[PDB]
């Protein structure tokens, strides 16, 4: 006897709407919905997600999260809100206090152990105390992660791993556009983005690779450079026109040096696209032998959401704590989001 | 910790690569078997092209029991033949001496339906003697965990479509022979086409179904000769193949599941005209559609490196004939060492 996995969606923006539609297609049940956005509070989650039949799941503001957790009897909270642990920790604490497993697409949560050590250790203790698992997943899990380590499993010697990834700032909400400096003039970009040099998404995903490959990080160097176009580009995400020479987004170059010798160099571009530009994911393992993998035009948003859903049975089965996916076996295709 | 102790059975092109590379990863060659007249009584290091002899004389197979009793080996690597009926002799010797065996023999990757009785016999023998037998090679990642790791980021799979191509000349006589290299069209039809023996991707498609949790309903295979407009040399057979003779074999395997998804795999093993390269391109068709390309895979080096990376898992695995779908994916290993 199987029952649907019971999901609270926290963040009912572009990604959250995709997850609401897709979790139901896999046989899961939406049992709670939280969003602070004015336009969405009090609407039916089904309606907002573009379903034709309302779900009977009212979107609550976050100040009512404890009420929606107590009512919902959920197996899992999916959190699609912000990129950094400081801005995710509040929602993760709520899920943990209620003993509800949580998975976030928030990029830092993929591997936050050094970048937000104290928040991660506190959440790990709380999740342990309440007998639930927290984790970070998304596009990184396969495409900047297990894709590379499965190919490393066919490699005799690795000298260097080199990654090139690119995604469209317009496909995601304002947390991503903001992190990438979309619409900033060159001087403001340098001063706000370049100067503060906050860990890019591939800072955390390169640490995940080292953890799964069994390497120890010695140093990480990052440069954030504005991306630019010769014409004006419109940001539907931030609702701003970006004139030629203003930042259309950010290229991050991260070089991860290990004690063991190998280095991971990852170029990560989030920007507005000129006509004919597409998502990229290309990796080379340099050593013996040299191997290059190319994903032809990854459907980055769809792939993000599908790995989150495929992870859910492993998240339920996982031991309690904040357990990053480097400690899991790779995500497997799940036909139905149901549990015994 | 001590080096893993390896008997190399088959000291041809792949066996020479393994002898050189296993030592580079900190394993120790303790035995060598080869039936080739040119290699019998020579030092395995010398034959592998090392400048310093290893003190390991290549024995003919009629002396295999003697080399196993003497060597006290942890692992036998078997690089000889493609099909279980031709591998069984060596696997029986390894198992009777309680030594773990891993073969690049392609049927051994997943032989449970194609050679059921041989596999069940070897499984009980291996169990009686407290050792693990398995099949690995290029298939393990590039026709296997590469696909299932991408499947982990997929919402719905309708069809998996594979195109792979390798150079018949990179592997020695047994593979050239299996691919009908140098056969005239009539002999090809009669020996190869007519008998329709399981191509390598018959067994690898069954492995994919086992790891994705699908049940095979039917498998259909067409074997067609490959041809060139010019004469080509097989360095493995040392013969010229004139225009219109078989330069190798294209296999098309359609694997239908009870669940609905189908795996359609196109597999070409042939002599290469100038400019031709190895290929490995897969599409997961469904939601979303994902295409992965390996740019000119170094198929031989990848075959050997995944066998070595598998060794710690082969030692750890329970006794019996345990196909690699029951293992977690191969992981990059720096040092081939074991306890006590
Ligand atoms: N790991 C990955 O592979 C991956 C993939 C895609 C996106 N992401 C990231 O995950 C996050 C969500 O992406 P998205 O594109 O769906 O952004 P989005 O369209 O802005 O949607 C997020 C929703 O959450 C709301 N929100 C933000 N903070 C909240 C809080 N504390 N409580 C309740 N609701 C809150 C937002 O409201 P407002 O609009 O009012 O702020 C919005 O409705 C972003 O930071 C993005 O970078 C990660
Ligand atoms: N951070 C998300 C947006 C695209 C890159 C990886 C997933």
UniProtKB/TrEMBL annotation, chain B:
Fetch the InterPro entries from UniProt: DAP_DH_C, NAD(P)-bd_dom_sf
Cross-referenced CDD domains: nat-AmDH_N_like
What keywords is this UniProt entry annotated with? Nucleotide-binding
Organism encoding this protein = Cystobacter fuscus (strain ATCC 25194 / DSM 2262 / NBRC 100088 / M29)
Gene Ontology terms, MF aspect: nucleotide binding
Provide the protein name. 2,4-diaminopentanoate dehydrogenase C-terminal domain-containing protein
- List ligand-binding residues for NAD(+): 9, 13-14, 34-35, 39, 80, 106, 172-173, 303
Please give the SUPFAM superfamilies that the UniProt record associates with this protein.
NAD(P)-binding Rossmann-fold domains
Q: Does the keyword Transmembrane helix apply?
A: no
Signal peptide positions on this chain: none
Ligand binding (NADP(+)): 9, 13-14, 34-36, 39, 80, 82, 104, 106, 136, 138, 172
What sequence ranges are listed for the domain 2,4-diaminopentanoate dehydrogenase C-terminal? 145-324
Q: Looking at the record's lineage, which domain of life comes first?
A: Bacteria
């Amino acid at each position: 006897s199987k029952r649907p996995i019971r999901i609270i969606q926290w963040g009912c923006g572009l990604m959250g709407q995709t997850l609401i539609r897709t979790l139901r297609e896999k046989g899961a049940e939406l049992v709670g919905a939280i969003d602070h956005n004015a336009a969405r509070r009090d609407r039916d989650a089904g309606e907002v997600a573009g379903l034709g039949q309302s779900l009977g799941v009212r979107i609550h503001p976050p100040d009512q999260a404890d009420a929606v957790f107590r009512e919902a009897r959920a197996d899992v909270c999916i959190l699609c809100t912000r990129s950094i642990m400081s801005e995710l920790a509040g929602a993760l604490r709520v899920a943990a206090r209620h003993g509800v497993n949580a998975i976030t697409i928030g990029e830092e949560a993929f591997y936050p152990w050094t970048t937000s050590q104290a928040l991660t250790e506190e959440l790990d203790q709380l999740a342990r105390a309440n007998d639930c698992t927290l984790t970070g997943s998304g596009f990184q899990d396969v495409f900047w992660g297990n894709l590379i380590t499965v190919l490393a499993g066919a490699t005799h010697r690795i000298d260097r791993i080199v990654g090139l990834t690119q995604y469209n700032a317009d496909d995601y909400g304002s947390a991503l556009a903001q992190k990438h400096g979309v619409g900033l003039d060159p001087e403001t970009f340098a001063a706000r983005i370049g100067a503060s040099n906050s860990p890019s998404y591939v800072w955390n995903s390169n640490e995940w690779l080292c953890a799964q490959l069994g390497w120890r990080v010695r140093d990480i160097r990052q440069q954030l450079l504005p991306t630019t176009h010769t014409g004006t580009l419109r940001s539907a995400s931030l609702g701003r026109e970006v004139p030629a020479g203003h930042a259309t987004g950010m290229k991050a170059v991260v070089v991860t040096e290990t004690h063991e010798g190998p280095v991971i160099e990852t170029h990560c571009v989030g920007k507005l696209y000129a006509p004919g530009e597409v998502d990229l994911n290309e990796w080379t393992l340099r050593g013996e032998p040299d191997t290059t993998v190319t994903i032809r035009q990854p459907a980055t948003p769809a792939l993000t959401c599908a790995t989150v859903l495929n992870r859910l049975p492993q998240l339920l089965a996982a031991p309690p704590g904040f357990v990053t996916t480097d400690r899991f076996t790779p995500a497997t295709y799940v036909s139905r989001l149901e549990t015994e």
